[PDB]
Design a protein around this nucleic acid. Structure first.
Ligand SMILES: Nc1[nH]c(=O)nc2c1ncn2[C@@H]1O[C@H](COP(=O)(O)OP(=O)(O)OP(=O)(O)O)[C@@H](O)[C@H]1O
Ligand SMILES: [Mg+2]
Ligand SMILES: [Zn+2]
Lengths: 584, 1136, 41, 71, 127
DNA sequence: TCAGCGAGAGAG
RNA sequence: AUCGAGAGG
DNA sequence: CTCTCTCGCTGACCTCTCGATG
């Protein structure tokens, strides 16, 4: 039965390779039997003896001495030694991994309303995944007697099973997994919320740990069965226990993109905005004034603030004063937990500032307040990013007015340096470096002019006079807040694309003097494709190196466990400064 | 310009500025032209079947011809057979005509029907035959000294390599075998040491001359010819049976026999040109002079009087198409016949024998049908939309029989080469393991008579550019100076500037007016067909352009076709050349039209003598494609209309009045909305769903076969044990479902509907052989197919019969006899039998059709590499709106634009807003019922806008009815065309916006639909073209609790088709180990898989309300123990 | 081959061996379990 | 007990023993038949056991003493 | 119920003790009638019943007969799962080497003795 | 193919 | 079941 | 004793569709 004969829809059968090698060996061995009885001359016998040892070597390990035997097709047959070794052998395909029951798979979308410990599960999947529990709860209440009545009731989809299912998932966690599992944060435990539809909803704050996106991605779901498994899921793998990385110390749940943009927009300030110069009794008055339409989010005002600080014994002591701030910061102050200073929000916030806020809260207050603080931060960021109406247009990509003069001067310089080569005055290999340096300097000049024109643009009127301030450009705000942009890519958008390289690695003499707002021509576009294809091929053809290295590293050190409490030895190493604090 | 009838109904406005001097060619020439030179008669006998017959032909061959196919394409597709023709050959020994076999035929669009399915043969790019000199750069030896080598490659035969050694010694290899000293081969050609020294020496330097031959002779352990032959024989064939006759024959047949070696005409030409000879013709076999010349050239390169070749140069690789591979396979099949003929010609007989007795047609047919159906280059054709087929038919592959391998291929062959300019697209390529190994043909590219790609250029004479066009190849163009296509010319053809940007010798620079030789023909010469459909491509990054070109081929046709407002101008060419429409063969007047048939009455000056003169077009209705999609044709002409030649009479899938149309036009705003477009999510309105703008039709097939098993015979009947009477309601008296029945999951069709799948029955087919017995429904339906098919043919012939009868009655017996003969022939063709498989009596096939609507979890994309998944369907009173109360359709996140530098998607959004703005102004004028003069004035002002464009439309020559019809067709927006590298500027877009009474920034004020408050900044709103890709969440959701298991390893099966489970691999086990969850790991390893008793105990315990497990031992460990014991090794468990 | 020649024994003291056989790994919530076995040997 | 289990970890001592103690306590209520020491509040046995551990009414020594008393 | 795994070379007596049946010369399943050949690769006597608690001939079809071999067939009545367990053996008519112990980088069957791999391989292949 | 390593003959 | 071809993350 | 030089031998995540052959 370990080498069975499988019937087909037609009369014919499908057989294994082993049954052929056995028959070959049997036939040849029986052929040797007749020769001994007939007393054939040893010349004929010696040929047959060489034959049998050729057959056996095929059955044990085919191809050690090249004589590979094939079948109906021109493909080598598989020996016994081929079924226990390799990537498709018993060890690596059936014993270190396998397929399981109570599992499912689907596409993932976003749910912006969930709490950190929740997930959204379709009820069509949930009904199938939890069938025995429903059968048991049906038999318990007497609604069915046999084991087929419950099956019929579930198949007919009556109106009473939709409450049993709600009762049997109330506090039962599930496991979610994404296919490339690079570290242990690739499997996590959540609590299901029954939804309509066919897609799974995932919390926005857990994407970075999964390396997940909403472009077509998929995910798998598993169900724990025993009490010990449920308690292990709740106490070890639940997403509210995994907030710091195990490879370093920094947190892993961090806001990004829309949340960063929203908080950054609230916490900025302007000059001569509506309602500037008021004195307020607290944050609630600021919220009233903003909602009524009587003040701007960016107005500079005075507000009375109360804060708390911890003493030596661990108790909280209050302190009240008046502070210079803005309406948006006073509004944001209402979600900060007690025990933190007011200076932590009296500035414009970016990615680093928000991450530092979360880390400080965890350091001072503990674990439970941090989850609430993170969820409130996400809600407020989503709420206030939409109210701003931030967009993108073609007029936001501003090109400096001095680009033409710089480019013309560089061209004149490189044209003049050819006169030193027409009449011998420089090495034939020396003009190359001079031209490269000239073009690099011109590129730097153009980039600096563009960035100086973009970052600061106010020309604003303050009570009569003219003043300058940080700009409110959409692209500049996106780059400065740390949401998506980089200063290098704004160069390609509105400066110069720069110098390209040949496929071998040399530098092309003349650069690309066009950005993406004003298009490229055929030659520049043709030149730009070498690097694109090279990068794509590099990405595609060297994931296997990393996979192989990781597998070897896991196999070498897989059996090292902490098995003792104190060794007692006095040895050590001496650490020197990278700061010293980060190293000890 | 004079406009065609199809194009005068809706004229696209063009923004291009450079005049066109050459037309886009027919896009399917590479297949039809190749297959033509395989079956057409060639008196010079050098291309196809004639060459193969003359290359092997005692028996005398006279001629050949091809017969008439038994069935046509449609009947072959319906029945499930191959569309082929018989091959007849005339031989003399007496004169007789014999039968050789069946040759598959190519259809009108460049495909093959093999077993009822359409297939495509992909062209191959491979190394050319000849001689090549190469050298490894380094790392062969630690000394860091380069080594030079030379190789000879024929079309057929064995290889030959010469190479050097770290000690400067010559060595030779045959068929990649072990090395031998070189001079041995010289000794095998009747040369003594004196003659060798005379050949290679005249004196021995140390920098420009070398003693390499003398030292090699020193190391050579041979001094006689026979010693050389025996050494070669021992090296080639171990075993050493040295005989004088054996040694001579091997060397004679190795390189000097016409039946074992062939250096083709192209190989001869390249070989001669590499050695700087004069003639380009010769023989297919080698000679001593050739080998000596190769040795001298290699030695000279070693000395320093030459250079090595580039292996990736596109002048060294050539193209092989289907008409060549078919000939190769036919010759392979033919050489097996002659052995049998020679064997049967030695038995001894006369008089009674005939040529047919010595010919067996099995091997030839076997080889041909193996190639057409089992080759790696014969592929299941891609049929998602019209663009997919065009892209598939124009593909080039570096893999195949004489090709490369995915894993062994390095990095240099996958790169873009400077010689690809104008021949291979540098953008469109797969993104997986096949990157760089699959390519697409450029728009104007061709091949010459040897098989090398070439591209066209304009001749320049005395400083003026003319209209004379020459096709140049990679070798030729390196000796010239070629100017770009965007150079400025005056009315006399002179260059305006004194310095021109030009290409020469693989570099680019500036040249004078009088140093230029040629010029480009177009600005879209370097891209492929798919990449030329992306507007504003020059504002996009190359990675995103690749993504968009690839994703444009996955779109699904919708219920209604909708043209793009912003296009490039290549839609008509693709739509017409694809072959999915109906095109008029001759001009005339429409006589009859309904939903499934068109009749044309031909003009007087296009009729042959003695002809009735009507054309009949039948249309395809609700047929499934290879991807389970829908194919449907719809007429687009009215009764009594005049038609010219080449006009579109009906539309195919994804076509709108003769233009390609893959998606829908949507109103979009760029802004964030409450986290519902967080990463790449898309928020959609409910009005989109209510209007069915992304609803698709899918068709599925199911089969039922009753076996002829001897144990129990089975037949189709209504009676079924243990079923209700309601179950048989949809079944007829014969047990087959009615047409028009609405079924759902778990219903009997022929007794069967797969779980979760619904639909409607639209087609039932019955297949029977020449056997016995028949059913009532088959008598009612299978006979109904034949009677209906006869009725359609009778109706078609009736029109011609009536016309001829009316003409005559104004020799009827001859006409009546002819028409009766035609009817009898049609009936006989329709009444033939079917050849089934043994053990099968009859087959029943059922077709189902279902409709699919969008829902959260479906994938959408544009043309610029932007893709996403739908997250929410929003009520209409929640969407943002404007000052007139108009809401938007789609909301997209701006944060996805600045990181991926695809700026073009913004520019399109600005232009589409302008286009719609024109249509609105027309729409109002049609509601108020104004006079034709005002419409004329406004439309003329609209068509004249631009900065020195080349279109020049004039409406003063239009009739009033024509103007009204154009205005009616223009009332939903004015279409606009912008070529890939010669398009519209920002200033022109702003002028169009101003003409439409819209802001020139492209941004307006919006209000919140839930509170009525105004957003704080202006937002970008416009129109953009969206696509629906074939990744539907209905096909991806799956779940399981318990089911079926495998046989050897008692583990769950895999795959949604067979209700399988998910795989828990090694990396997941590592993750669970790193968590510390031992009980979860043990539960997954045993009781959910491989534990036969534990699984049952766990199930019973769960049903009883007790959550506890009793693990045991997995079965795979027992299997492994038995398997290891079968190798003769004792392995066991130590209980004590 | 080397193991069959030498005649070796395996005590199943690592993670992979217990995974292959199908027992509790000697780490985490299973660690204490293995501590009992040594106490009974 | 809900959302976060950090309270019981500081009382038992480590995460790997809390799972075993909670499972031993919960199996008594689910199958053996026993009454909770806290209001049920419509909870599963695992959550009730975690709540009892958090309050301070359950640990290994108490269960051992009760088992000795029963026999 | 176990605590270690042992591995070692086998001997003819051990292999004979594993087997439930003698050598098997016939080939296959008799494609015409699916019942297996006697004394073959698929054989009911050597390896076990084809169906649960049923004889090949069919004389005994009850649990009361459990543990009884058939006089006319020689087939025991037992659960069919034993077909996954029982093994067999073949009697070679001449000694044959083991490819694993001959071909390797540190060859074993040729390291106990002095001679290298080339000449010993020549001897084994009758040359 | 390409990179890496050990077993085996050489010429001093 | 194996082989070949293609697609998605 | 001890560098050169041939010459083999072993290695390079998850999911879906089609057809031809057993
Ligand atoms: N061959 C491969 N092997 C592998 O082991 N993992 C692969 C993979 N190919 C894709 N992935 C996964 O897919 C993610 C990026 O692919 P993608 O969804 O498009 O997002 P991307 O970041 O590129 O941004 P976008 O294209 O939307 O602009 C990538 O990390 C990875 O997990
Ligand atoms: Mg993704
Ligand atoms: Zn019996």
């Amino acid at each position: 039965d370990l080498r069975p004969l499988v019937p087909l829809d037609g009369g014919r059968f499908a057989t294994s390779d082993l049954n052929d090698l056995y028959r070959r060996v049997i036939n040849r061995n029986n052929r040797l039997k007749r020769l001994l009885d007939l007393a054939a001359p040893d010349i004929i016998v010696r040929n047959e003896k060489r034959m049998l040892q050729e057959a056996v070597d095929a059955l044990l390990d085919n191809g050690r001495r090249g004589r590979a035997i094939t079948g109906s097709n021109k493909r080598p047959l598989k020996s016994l030694a081929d079924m226990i070794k390799g990537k498709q052998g018993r060890f690596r395909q059936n014993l270190l991994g396998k397929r399981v029951d109570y599992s499912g798979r689907s596409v993932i979308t976003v749910g912006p309303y969930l709490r950190l410990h929740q997930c959204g599960l379709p009820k069509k999947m949930a009904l199938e995944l939890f069938k025995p529990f429903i059968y048991g709860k049906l038999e318990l209440r007497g609604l069915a007697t046999t084991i087929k009545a419950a099956k019929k009731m579930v198949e007919r989809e009556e109106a009473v099973v939709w409450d049993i299912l709600d009762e049997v998932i109330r506090e039962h966690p599930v496991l979610l997994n994404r296919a490339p599992t690079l570290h242990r944060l690739g499997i996590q435990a959540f609590e299901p919320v029954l939804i309509e539809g066919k897609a799974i909803q995932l919390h926005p704050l857990v994407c970075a740990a999964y390396n997940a996106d909403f472009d077509g991605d998929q995910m798998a779901v598993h169900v724990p069965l025993t009490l010990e498994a449920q308690l292990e899921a709740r106490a070890l793998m639940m997403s509210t226990n995994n907030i710091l990385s195990p490879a370093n110390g920094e947190p892993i749940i961090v806001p990004s993109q829309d949340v960063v943009l929203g908080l950054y927009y609230m916490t900025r300030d302007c000059v001569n905005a509506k309602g500037e110069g008021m004195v307020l009794t607290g944050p609630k008055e600021a919220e009233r004034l903003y909602r009524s339409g009587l003040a701007s989010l960016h107005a500079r005002v005075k507000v009375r603030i109360t804060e708390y600080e911890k003493d030596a014994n661990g108790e909280l002591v209050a302190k009240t004063s008046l502070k210079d701030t803005t309406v948006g910061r006073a509004i944001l102050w209402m979600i900060v937990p007690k025990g933190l200073p007011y200076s932590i929000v009296n500035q414009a916030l970016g990615k680093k500032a928000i991450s530092k806020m979360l880390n400080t809260c965890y350091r001072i207050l503990g674990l439970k307040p941090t989850v609430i603080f993170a969820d409130q931060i996400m809600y407020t960021g989503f709420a206030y990013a939409a109210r701003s109406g931030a967009s993108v247009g073609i007029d936001d990509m501003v090109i400096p007015e001095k680009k033409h003069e710089i480019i013309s001067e560089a061209e004149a310089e490189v044209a003049e340096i050819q006169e030193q080569f027409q009449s011998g005055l420089v090495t034939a290999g020396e003009r190359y470096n001079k031209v490269i340096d000239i073009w690099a300097a011109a590129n730097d000049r153009v980039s600096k002019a563009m960035m100086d024109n973009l970052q600061t643009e106010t020309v604003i009127n303050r009570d009569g006079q003219e003043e300058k301030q940080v700009s409110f450009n959409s692209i500049y705000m996106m780059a400065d807040s740390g949401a998506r942009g980089s200063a290098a890519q704004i160069r390609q958008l509105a400066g110069m694309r720069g110098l390209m390289a040949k496929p071998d690695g040399s530098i092309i003499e003349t650069p690309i003097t066009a950005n993406f707002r004003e298009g490229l021509n055929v030659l520049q576009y043709f030149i730009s494709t070498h690097g694109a294809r090279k990068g794509l091929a590099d990405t595609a053809l060297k994931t296997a190196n990393s996979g192989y290295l990781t597998r070897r590293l896991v196999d070498v050190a897989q059996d090292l466990v902490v098995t003792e409490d104190d060794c007692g030895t006095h040895e050590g190493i001496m650490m020197t400064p990278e700061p010293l604090r980060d190293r000890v | 310009m004079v406009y065609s009838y199809t194009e005068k109904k809706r004229i696209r406005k063009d923004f291009g500025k450079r005049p066109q001097v050459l037309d886009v060619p027919y896009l399917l020439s590479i297949q039809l032209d190749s297959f033509q030179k395989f079956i057409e008669q060639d008196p010079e006998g050098q291309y196809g079947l004639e060459a193969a017959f003359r290359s092997v032909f005692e028996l005398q061959y006279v001629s050949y011809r091809l017969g008439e196919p038994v069935f046509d394409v449609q009947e072959c597709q319906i029945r499930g057979v191959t569309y082929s023709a018989p091959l007849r050959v005339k031989l003399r020994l007496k004169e007789q005509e014999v039968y050789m076999g069946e040759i598959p035929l190519m259809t009108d669009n460049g495909t093959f029907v093999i077993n009822g399915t359409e297939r495509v043969i992909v062209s191959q790019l491979h190394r050319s035959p000849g001689v090549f000199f190469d050298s490894d750069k380094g790392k062969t030896h630690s000394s860091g000294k380069v080594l030079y080598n030379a190789r000879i490659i024929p079309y057929r035969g064995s290889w030959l390599d010469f190479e050097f050694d770290p000690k400067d010694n010559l060595f030779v290899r045959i068929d990649r075998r072990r090395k031998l000293p070189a001079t041995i081969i010289l000794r095998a050609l009747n040369y003594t040491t004196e003659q060798i020294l005379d050949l290679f020496f005249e004196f021995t330097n140390d920098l420009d001359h070398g003693p390499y031959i003398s030292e090699t002779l020193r190391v050579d352990p041979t001094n006689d010819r026979l010693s050389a032959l025996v050494e070669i024989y021992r090296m080639m064939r171990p075993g050493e049976p040295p005989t004088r006759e054996a040694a001579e024959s091997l060397f004679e047949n190795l390189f000097f026999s016409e039946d074992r070696y062939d250096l083709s005409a192209v190989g001869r030409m390249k070989f001669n040109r590499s050695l700087l000879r004069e003639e380009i013709e010769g023989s297919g076999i080698l000679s001593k002079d050739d080998i000596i010349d190769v040795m001298k050239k290699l030695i000279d390169i070693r000395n320093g009087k030459g250079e090595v070749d580039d292996i990736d140069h596109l002048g060294n690789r050539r193209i092989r198409s289907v008409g060549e591979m078919a000939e190769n396979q036919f010759r392979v099949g033919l050489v097996r016949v002659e052995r049998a003929v020679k064997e049967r010609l030695s038995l001894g007989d006369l008089d009674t024998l005939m040529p047919q007795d010595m010919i067996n047609a099995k091997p030839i047919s076997a080889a041909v049908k193996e190639f057409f159906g089992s080759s790696q280059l014969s592929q299941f054709m891609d049929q998602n939309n019209p663009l997919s087929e065009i892209t598939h038919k124009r593909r080039i592959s570096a893999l195949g029989p004489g090709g490369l391998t995915r894993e062994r291929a390095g990095f240099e062959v996958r790169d873009v080469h400077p010689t690809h300019y104008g021949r291979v697209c540098p953008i469109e390529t797969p993104e997986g393991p096949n990157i760089g190994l699959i390519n697409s043909l450029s728009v104007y590219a061709q091949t010459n008579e040897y098989g090398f790609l070439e591209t066209p250029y304009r001749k320049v004479t005395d400083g003026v550019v003319t209209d004379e066009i020459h096709y140049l190849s990679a070798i030729e163009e390196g000796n010239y100076v070629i100017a770009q296509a965007n150079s400025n010319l005056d009315e006399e053809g002179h260059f305006v500037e004194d310095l021109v940007t030009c290409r020469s010798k693989g570099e680019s620079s500036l040249f004078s007016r009088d140093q230029v030789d040629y010029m480009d023909v177009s600005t879209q010469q370097v891209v492929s067909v798919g990449a030329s459909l992306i507007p504003f491509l020059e504002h996009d990054d190359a990675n995103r352009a690749l993504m968009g070109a690839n994703m444009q081929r996955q779109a699904v046709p919708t219920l209604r076709a909708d043209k793009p407002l912003v296009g490039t101008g290549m839609e008509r060419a693709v739509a017409v050349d694809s072959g999915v429409t109906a095109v008029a063969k001759r001009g005339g007047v429409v006589q009859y039209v309904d939903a499934s048939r068109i009749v044309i009455k031909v003009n007087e000056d296009e009729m042959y003598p003695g002809e009735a003169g009507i054309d009949i077009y039948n249309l395809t209705k609700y047929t499934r494609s290879n991807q389970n999609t829908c194919i449907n044709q719809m007429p687009c002409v009215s009764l009594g209309e005049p038609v010219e030649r080449g006009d579109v009479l009906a539309d195919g899938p994804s076509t709108d009045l003769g233009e390609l149309a893959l998606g829908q036009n949507m109103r979009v705003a760029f802004m964030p909305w409450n986290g519902y477009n967080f990463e790449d999510s898309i928020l959609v309105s409910e009005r989109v769903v209510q209007e069915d703008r992304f609803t698709t039709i899918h068709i599925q097939e199911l089969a039922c076969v009753s076996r002829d098993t001897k144990l129990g015979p089975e037949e189709i009947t209504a009676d079924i044990p243990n079923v209700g009477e309601a179950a048989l309601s949809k079944l007829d008296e014969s047990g087959i479902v009615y047409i028009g029945a609405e079924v759902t999951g778990g219903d009997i069709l022929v007794g069967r509907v797969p779980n979760g799948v619904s639909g409607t029955v639209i087609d039932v087919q019955v297949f029977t052989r020449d056997g016995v017995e028949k059913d009532k429904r088959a008598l009612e339906i299978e006979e109904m197919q034949l009677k209906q098919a006869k009725k359609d043919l009778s109706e078609e012939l009736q029109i011609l019969e009536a016309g001829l009868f009316s003409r005559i009655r104004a020799q009827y017996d001859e006409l009546k006899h002819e028409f009766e003969k035609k009817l009898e022939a049609k009936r006989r063709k329709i009444t033939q039998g079917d050849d089934l498989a043994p053990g099968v009596l009859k087959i029943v096939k059922v077709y189902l059709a279902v409709k699919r609507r969008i829902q959260p979890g479906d994938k959408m994309a544009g043309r610029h590499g932007n893709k996403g998944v739908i997250s929410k369907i929003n009520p209409i009173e929640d969407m943002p709106y404007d000052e007139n109360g108009t809401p938007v359709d789609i909301v997209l996140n701006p944060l996805g634009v600045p990181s991926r530098m695809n700026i073009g998607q913004i520019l399109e959004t600005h232009l589409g807003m302008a286009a719609k703005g024109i249509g609105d102004k027309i729409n109002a004028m049609l509601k108020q019922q104004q006079e034709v003069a005002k419409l004329r004035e406004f439309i003329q002002r609209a068509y004249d806008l631009g900065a020195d464009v080349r279109q020049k439309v004039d409406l003063s020559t239009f009739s009033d009815e024509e103007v009204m019809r154009l205005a009616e067709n223009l009332r939903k927006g004015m279409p606009i065309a912008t070529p890939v590298f010669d398009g519209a500027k920002e200033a022109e877009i702003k002028e169009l916006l101003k003409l439409g009474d819209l802001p020139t920034s492209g941004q307006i004020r919006l209000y919140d639909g839930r509170t009525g408050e105004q957003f704080e900044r202006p937002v970008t709103v416009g129109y953009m073209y969206m696509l629906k890709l074939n990744h539907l969440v209905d096909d991806k959701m799956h779940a399981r609790s318990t089911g079926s298991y495998s046989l050897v390893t008692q583990q769950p099966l895999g795959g949604k088709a067979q209700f399988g489970g998910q795989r828990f691999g090694e990396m997941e086990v590592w993750a669970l180990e790193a968590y510390g969850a031992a009980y979860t790991l043990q539960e997954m390893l045993t009781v959910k898989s491989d534990d036969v008793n534990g699984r049952t105990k766990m199930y019973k315990n769960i049903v009883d309300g007790n959550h506890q497990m009793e693990p045991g031992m997995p079965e795979s460990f027992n299997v492994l123990l038995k398997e290891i014991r079968s190798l003769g090794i004792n392995i066991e468990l130590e209980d004590e | 081959t080397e193991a069959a020649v030498a005649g070796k024994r395996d005590e199943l003291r690592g993670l992979k061996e217990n995974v292959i056989v199908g027992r509790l790994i000697p780490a985490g919530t299973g660690y204490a379990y293995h501590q009992d076995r040594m106490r009974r040997r | 007990a809900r959302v976060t289990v950090q309270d019981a970890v500081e009382k038992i001592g480590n995460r790997f023993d809390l799972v075993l103690v909670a499972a031993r306590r919960a199996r008594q209520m689910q199958v053996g038949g026993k009454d909770p020491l806290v209001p049920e509040e419509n909870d599963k046995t695992t959550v009730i056991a975690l709540r009892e551990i958090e309050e301070g009414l359950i640990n290994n020594q108490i269960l051992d003493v009760r088992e000795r008393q029963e026999q | 119920e176990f605590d270690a795994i042992k591995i070692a070379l086998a001997s003819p007596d051990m292999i004979r003790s594993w087997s439930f049946g003698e050598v098997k010369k016939p080939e296959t399943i008799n494609y015409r009638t699916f019942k297996p050949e006697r004394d073959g690769l698929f054989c009911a006597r050597i390896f076990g019943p084809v169906k649960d608690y049923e004889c090949l001939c069919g004389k005994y079809k009850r649990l009361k007969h459990r543990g009884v071999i058939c006089e006319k067939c020689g087939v025991e009545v037992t659960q069919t799962k034993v077909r996954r367990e029982r093994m067999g053996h073949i009697e070679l008519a001449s000694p044959t080497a083991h490819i694993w112990f001959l071909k390797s980088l540190p060859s074993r069957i040729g390291l106990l003795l002095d001679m290298p791999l080339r000449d010993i391989e020549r001897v084994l292949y009758f040359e």
